[PDB]
């Protein structure tokens, strides 16, 4: 509804929405934004987008992202899982451990 400002042809709506958006306590924004997680990598850089979406889903998506971001699973971990499933002196080689 914040987008309706100076676009809805309903006068009172525009006046009210303009009031709320000119209050210091509420600031609409859209598109790419400066997150704390900017330039963090996880094969690809993380970025923030101010999306039009309910805050519950926003929250869950953010949770899932940070969940992936903090996992620090590496090749060493999978190599270890393989070694547990291999005859006792098998050797594994390949990816950098990290």
């Amino acid at each position: 509804p914040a987008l309706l400002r100076d676009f809805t042809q309903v006068n009172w709506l525009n006046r009210d929405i303009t009031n709320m958006l000119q209050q210091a306590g509420t600031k609409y924004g859209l598109g790419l934004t400066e997150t704390r997680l900017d330039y963090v990598r996880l094969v690809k850089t993380i970025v923030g987008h101010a999306l039009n979406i309910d805050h519950f889903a926003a929250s869950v998506l953010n949770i899932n992202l940070r969940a992936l971001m903090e996992a620090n699973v590496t090749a060493d971990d999978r190599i270890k899982a393989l070694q547990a499933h291999s005859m006792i002196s098998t050797q594994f080689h390949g990816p950098n451990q990290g």
């Binding site: 094969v43 690809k44 999978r78 393989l82 080689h93 390949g94």
Partner: protein, 50 residues
């Protein structure tokens, strides 16, 4: 900075195959970068981990 997804173009890969004894010669050596490599079967990392 990002990882290449498309197949990248690579320098030609001459396999030197050193033995106990050989006669080294460098006539018609390539001037461009080249990946000399010693063993024939280097596709060793077979087991993909999903």
């Amino acid at each position: 900075d990002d990882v290449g997804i498309m197949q990248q173009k690579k320098p030609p890969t001459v396999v030197q195959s050193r033995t106990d004894v050989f006669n080294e010669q460098f006539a018609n050596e390539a001037l461009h970068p080249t990946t000399k490599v010693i063993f024939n079967g280097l596709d060793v990392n077979t087991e993909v981990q999903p």
